[PDB]
A paper describes a structure:
One such mechanism widely found across Firmicute bacteria involves antimicrobial peptide sensing and resistance membrane protein complexes collectively known as Bce modules. These modules are composed minimally of an ATP-binding cassette (ABC) transporter which defends against antimicrobial peptides without transport across the membrane, and an interacting two-component system containing a sensor histidine kinase and response regulator. In this module bceA encodes the ATPase domains, bceB encodes the membrane-spanning permease domain of the ABC transporter BceAB, and bceS encodes the histidine kinase that phosphorylates the response regulator encoded by bceR. Previous studies have established that BceAB mediates resistance against bacitracin, likely by freeing bacitracin from the lipid target undecaprenyl-pyrophosphate (UPP). To understand this critical membrane protein interaction and the molecular details underpinning the Bce module flux-sensing mechanism, we have determined the cryo-EM structure of the complete BceAB-S complex from B. subtilis in nucleotide-free and ATPγS-bound states.
To investigate this hypothesis, we pursued a cryo-EM structure of wild-type BceAB-S with the non-hydrolysable ATP analog ATPγS. Initial 3D classification of the resultant dataset revealed two distinct particle populations, with one population showing a large degree of heterogeneity in the intracellular DHp and CA domains of BceS, and a second population in which the entire BceS kinase was more clearly resolved. Subsequent classification and refinement produced two cryo-EM maps of the ATPγS-bound BceAB-S complex, one of which was obtained at 3.1 Å overall resolution showing high resolution features BceAB and the TM and HAMP domains of BceS, but disordered BceS DHp and CA domains. However, close inspection reveals that the BceA subunits are not fully dimerized and ATPγS engages the Walker-A motif and Tyr13 in the A-loop of BceA, but not the signature motif in the opposing BceA monomer.
Residue numbers in the entry:
A (entry chain B), B (entry chain C): 1 to 248
C (entry chain E), D (entry chain D): 1 to 334
E (entry chain A): 1 to 185, 193 to 646
Amino acid sequence: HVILEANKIRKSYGNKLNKQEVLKGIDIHIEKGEFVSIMGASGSGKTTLLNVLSSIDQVSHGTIHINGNDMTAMKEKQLAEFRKQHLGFIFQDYNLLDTLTVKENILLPLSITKLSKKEANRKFEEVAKELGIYELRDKYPNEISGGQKQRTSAGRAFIHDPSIIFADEPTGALDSKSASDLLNKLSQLNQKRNATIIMVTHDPVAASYCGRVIFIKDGQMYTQLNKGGQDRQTFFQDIMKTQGVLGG
Amino acid sequence: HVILEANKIRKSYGNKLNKQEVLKGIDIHIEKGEFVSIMGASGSGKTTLLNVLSSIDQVSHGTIHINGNDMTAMKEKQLAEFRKQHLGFIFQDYNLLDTLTVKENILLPLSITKLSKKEANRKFEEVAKELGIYELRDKYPNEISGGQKQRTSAGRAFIHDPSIIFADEPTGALDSKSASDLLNKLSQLNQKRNATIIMVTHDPVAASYCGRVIFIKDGQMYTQLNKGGQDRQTFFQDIMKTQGVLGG
Amino acid sequence: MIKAFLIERRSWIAAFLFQQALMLFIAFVDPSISFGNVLYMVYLCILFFIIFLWFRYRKETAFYKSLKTWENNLDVTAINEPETPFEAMVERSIAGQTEHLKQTAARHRLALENEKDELMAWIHEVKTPLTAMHLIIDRMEEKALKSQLSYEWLRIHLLLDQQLHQKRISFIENDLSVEFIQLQPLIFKEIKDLQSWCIQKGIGFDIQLEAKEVLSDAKWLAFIIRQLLTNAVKYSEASEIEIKSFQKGEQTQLQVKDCGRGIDPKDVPRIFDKGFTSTTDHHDQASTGMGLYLAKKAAAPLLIHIDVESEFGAGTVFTLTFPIRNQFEHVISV
Amino acid sequence: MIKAFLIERRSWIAAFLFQQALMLFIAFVDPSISFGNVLYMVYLCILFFIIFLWFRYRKETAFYKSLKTWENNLDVTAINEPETPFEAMVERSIAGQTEHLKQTAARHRLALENEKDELMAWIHEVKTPLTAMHLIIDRMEEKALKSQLSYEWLRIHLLLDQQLHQKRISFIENDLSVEFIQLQPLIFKEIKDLQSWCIQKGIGFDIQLEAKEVLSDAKWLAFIIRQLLTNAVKYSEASEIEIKSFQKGEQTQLQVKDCGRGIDPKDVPRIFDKGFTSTTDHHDQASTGMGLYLAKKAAAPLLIHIDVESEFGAGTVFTLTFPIRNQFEHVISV
Amino acid sequence: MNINQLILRNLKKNLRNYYLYVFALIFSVALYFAFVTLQYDPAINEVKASIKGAAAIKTASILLVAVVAIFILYANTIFIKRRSKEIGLFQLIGMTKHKIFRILSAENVMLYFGSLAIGVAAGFSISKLVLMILFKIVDVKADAKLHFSEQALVQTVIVFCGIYLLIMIMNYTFIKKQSILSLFKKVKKISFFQMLIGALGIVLILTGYYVSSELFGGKFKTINELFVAMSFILGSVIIGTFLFYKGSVTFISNIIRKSKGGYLNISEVLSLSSIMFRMKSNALLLTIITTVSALAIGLLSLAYISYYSSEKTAEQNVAADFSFMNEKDAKLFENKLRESNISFVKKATPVLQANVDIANIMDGTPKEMQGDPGNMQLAVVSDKDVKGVDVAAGEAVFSGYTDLLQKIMVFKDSGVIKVKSKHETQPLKYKGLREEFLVSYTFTSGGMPAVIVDDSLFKQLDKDKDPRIQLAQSTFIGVNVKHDDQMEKANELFQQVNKKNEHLSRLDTSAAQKSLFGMVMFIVGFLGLTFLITSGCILYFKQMGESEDEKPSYTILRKLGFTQGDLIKGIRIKQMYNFGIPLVVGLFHSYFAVQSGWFLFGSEVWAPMIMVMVLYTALYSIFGFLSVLYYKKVIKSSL
Ligand SMILES: CCCCCCCC/C=C\CCCCCCCC(=O)O[C@H](COC(=O)CCCCCCCCCCCCCCC)COP(=O)(O)OCCN
Ligand SMILES: Nc1ncnc2c1ncn2[C@@H]1O[C@H](COP(=O)(O)OP(=O)(O)OP(O)(O)=S)[C@@H](O)[C@H]1O
Ligand SMILES: Nc1ncnc2c1ncn2[C@@H]1O[C@H](COP(=O)(O)OP(=O)(O)OP(O)(O)=S)[C@@H](O)[C@H]1O
């Protein structure tokens, strides 16, 4: 059961004298309930790929099919309304509005639907107690630590149970303990409620929590690893071994 | 001949209620003419250390002695001239002026020091031919590519003859070939004029061009590796062996 | 830009100035109205009119300038966002024509794909009965008739295989595969495939290979060697072909020799040209000259160069200079 | 559309009103200028401005409406000639886009036509070697092997002829020829062509032609008859195939009958479907099954009706109705 | 390169972003030049008023300078706010602040002096329309002419060169406060103290309004407690306004927001979460704006009332059409009028100054004395002269209203007018009312209403001849006129008579009041319009800066997917709630300030207040619309 499907997508920046090509013929096949990671260096088109896969940017060529709907024909407003309802986003950086509390920040996407009052106050607590922020419900974002804001952002992204969740280096601003805690909670949330997460990283430690790793280099995918029955340590060692060949 | 000498520096962001420490008792000894790098996953406090060491931000505790002169006992003006004479900076994003051509954009720092035109012209020509962007002088920065922009930004920092170069991750916006070429040219410029280039990276293949590597974990250095007679292929493998341990 | 706006909105300017002209004229013939006190009104009106025109010009001459920029140069998305209805009922037509062009291009692509699929099906349908015919006629009891039929069948098979390679040159890039291959089995298989021609021409085979292991794709290298052998057989009559493989330093090479008529030095580099043929001999009119070109093109992605040393009256020598072992490792890193 | 015009030009009307207000105010304040004459001037200018607005709408709101009409239509001549530079830019942009689309379509059509020509050529030098092989092989003395080889060669030649006629059916319209055709020589030649199939399968033939003169195209009529007989022979085993031609009414009708297995009535109407292969036997899957479709399609321009009367377990009756001779006058006239 | 070339390129590239700045400078310069060129204009001396006319313009200019200085200082933020990464990069390269200051101040000078040059030309063009308006207001039929008045040019140049020093001072601090870290890149729970301040502000405002409304009802009829009440009202109103714009908006905002359990939508997020936290940071500006606007409107209304109340007070001040103090001068005037062929009906009406008792008629308060309760210099007239008001024995009719006396002194419904003579008494009763004063203000001082008694009663009164307070001229010598046919020539001959101008006239004094109060109203209206436009433009400038720190907030949520049409719908409500609170507060302040205008000097007008309350709303709506357009433009270019 494929959820996302791309066929030979391309993308370029600039014009005339500074027209550079970033993506060159990429094929992607993500399934339902999978937790996939694309790993590459800092010059590879990871953010560009995540932008064009979620309809934030526009491809020069190719075709993208999310959940059976062709997204190369919607103009702008259909794409925005599709993003508003069916997708979730987590970013490495500022996600929370400074003038709202935690509750009013992670109850924002539910305002489109008008899901009563108790039908929203129950779904808020059900996801808040799963991340340990239920005692931080009436605190402004300038009164909480670094990892608590990221957990709050993840709770906001998971509340309306979208089809695909796009994460761009979620643990790029946390120390070791906070990063490990957030990654473990993300994995548990994935396993409990079946959700497809596509994450782009440049850290093998954060990529060892996944189930399939795709190695990108200059807009071309050429390696795939599958976890299988191995635990986290063996998968981490295998990822380290694979990363050593593409760099030497 | 030690040129930089930190001693038990500390730093903590936040005020009163919410305060979090970043640097925790770091001792650093750096020699002159040494191409030093610092490796660590994002969030370990690297750019904070580079801000502290470059005398851009103030410390909570500790003293830094660069070339004998004390750093924690000077005023804003004294720091200003000391930084103007003895420091150079390279960052990830090129900081260029679009209204100026490449030549007059590099020559901006050298046009305020009351110097004859011929000497500045000779210095610019020497630097440009060393880097290889000589033919792109009269082309405005919106008619060239990213690698050429980054090479111009790097060459701006090598024209007023500084003593220490403080470089952030300079190849974080370039592809593989451009990154390799820029790193090779930096290592070549280090060998002619003894500039103590200090680079902060999180990239295993970027720090294999150096002479010593220092590992940071959460605000405290862990290990050190020396180059010796390895040929950048054994040194890279050694870097990967320690990176794996520090990671998982 | 200024002239276009001024000439387009000329009726409005004329209408605006007509009232002031009328006031100035009327002030003469009216004793109760003074000229000096109405010239002040005229001045105060003309100042505001000039300011209003300057304000309107910048706002109005933007969408059409964007369209003029979009005309032919580049930046197909140089159009701006319309605000007035007249600028919307133009973008409507522009978008309609663009979408029609895009769907026509999609239709052309689908037609090309359908043609490729149909011609692949035809290739399968015309490759089935060559094999059926060969299997049926692999029962014959006479000598000369069997030799003639086998020669004709081998010629047709070679032509169809060359055509198939000519068509598969498009996807040869994706079909490159590296595995350990022994030269002796493939050479013996090629000799078996070319038994009838060598039997008729009395052409022997010599296999003296110092190195029997090569680093290249099996199918494409087999095509190259088969084409070289067929060219040598055509160019050499009643002569034995020497096949030797030796290690030229770090590059493995395979050498083929013959005692044929050879190639004139004036056309030695031109044998590998597309569709090239030799005008020296009358019987060369039946050769399309496609095996050499296809083999050389297929050897390029494998980092293999074909060396030719042919002399008139001596023969034709072909060398396949296989690359160094260390060069087939960049497909995973770069 | 008048509402759009008013909402498009509100600024100039506002400017005119402000000019009138300024005139009135300055006339009111100054004591040397009467306040009675200025009111009359204002009223006259308002009325004349209304008339001028009417004329301006009439002269302005044409090009955009014509463009809106043109974009949703099957013709291109619904656009008016340019009258101002602002419309000239839009016209030039539309012309450029249409020219780009036309040139792109023309180049792709030309490239596809050249590819089809290369395909048809390749068909020719695939079919020629079969003829050469037959010419070489028509010297055997044995019976069974010769009969099997003849059967195979006839099958392959019929497939190649079907491919050639499928390619030619695009230009069959311009290649139609009207001439007298003698049924008996054509049927004799067709029977002699399939002599090997009848010998191998033990299938008899009957020659009884009440009508001997027909008017059609010889090549395509012979093609249709040939594949009708071929299908009858292939789909029958040792059955008597009868050919009957009778003159009924004013139209000449020719019928082909075989006593084979036949076609099940469920799939009898589907025999004319393109690429139709019967599912009751696996041996029939390899058959192309296109010759019947080609015959039916090529019979339409010649006003020939290829009817079917097939009963399962009895056989299939193929009726060829030659059109009236007086009907060919329209073809001759055009 | 050369630094001057860099400055020139910066100017030529950034000139497209500085149009509001240039427009504001041009507008200010033009207004100041146009207003000041009247002071030195020789034609202004034709305004014959009590005050000179070139002396009030000086103080008005002193106020105008302060009005425009803050406008320009608030406009300079448009120029200075954008350049932050520029200074960061210049400090990264190595330049000190002493060179960045000069680099960024070498083009502000060029823009400022270009605007100064242009605004003088545009201020000279409209220098005649202003003079014509002023002449029309005070009704002068002279001719206006164009004039340059180079002294005004010199004064304007000096004033704006003085303001540029403040501009440089404010540039320096902003340049100083930036660092090298600017190249890359508060809100809290409400305590209990604010919960108290918010209620205190509303309480103070309401108490001030209630106390002020009782003043117009008739209470506090004594000078002593009037000033205490006035001072208390002013203090309470101002303190309540400050506490309203500090914690009384966050109070109600938090109360409303807490009703929703923490489940808002995009409109509420964009409106309430900003109004709660950003309005309190501007509390000393909104207070000044509202208070000054209310004061200006009230003063203008008072001036207009006094301007249209001139003919009545001219008629009251001089009882007759013409007044005299000598019999010979009046006879000479009559002799001059003999050839004028205008029938003079001069009547030296004899009125006896008989003191009466009106202490009991007063219905005020015992602390209200106004001197002797019943020993005023009141006068009584007979029935033969005023035959219309026929009065029987023991009755009287007062002839006069005297609004100032009416608001202080209250007459009893059935009071008795007892003539407190030397020995006899003549109690009288009140039947009718009149407003005609029988003598001019020279003889009646504060204004004694004429008393009409029975003819025989007046015969008894003037045969008594009480030796007490009595007019020096018992028979007032005031010449009257026939129907209004040739009054202008009569006044011309009157002026020809007394070269010393020792007498009075009706139409002569009917012009001094107009010529003074019209100029006062002109000055007040000019300053009020200037301030009214300036305050709204300042609010617009402030709003133009909240969308640039919110640019990241508009960039995000759009990746989440919200569409620009959903992001501007909340801005349309934010601007309503932003521009409508000061409007309502100022409107109520103006309404309560203008009620004191006709509490004392008249009864009611209602005519100009409504007309002035429409321009206020129109300007506020225009600036709100402009702010909405700017935020739409900012939002559009986020993603
Ligand atoms: C940007 C700031 C520029 C403001 C400069 C505007 C010029 C000075 C401004 C305001 C003056 C306010 C006048 C006070 C209220 C006027 C009411 C009044 O006085 O009552 C009567 C009416 O007064 C007038 O006639 C004056 C009529 C216009 C007065 C207001 C003019 C508004 C000017 C603002 C817009 C025009 C721009 C002027 C400067 C370019 C006086 O009696 P009369 O009608 O003259 O005699 C009748 C016999 N035919
Ligand atoms: N100005 C700041 N205020 C508050 N926290 C900060 C600030 N700068 C950094 N931090 C925090 O300090 C921690 C370490 O961040 P950095 O100092 O940037 O280390 P770093 O990630 O190695 O540097 P870069 O930018 O990725 S090369 C993180 O938890 C940040 O959130
Ligand atoms: N707006 C842009 N204009 C021009 N070039 C761009 C732009 N955005 C990205 N690029 C180029 O695209 C390259 C790769 O894209 P990136 O988005 O930077 O990939 P990335 O760096 O791996 O993503 P992150 O942010 O590190 S997770 C960069 O090195 C730039 O040279």
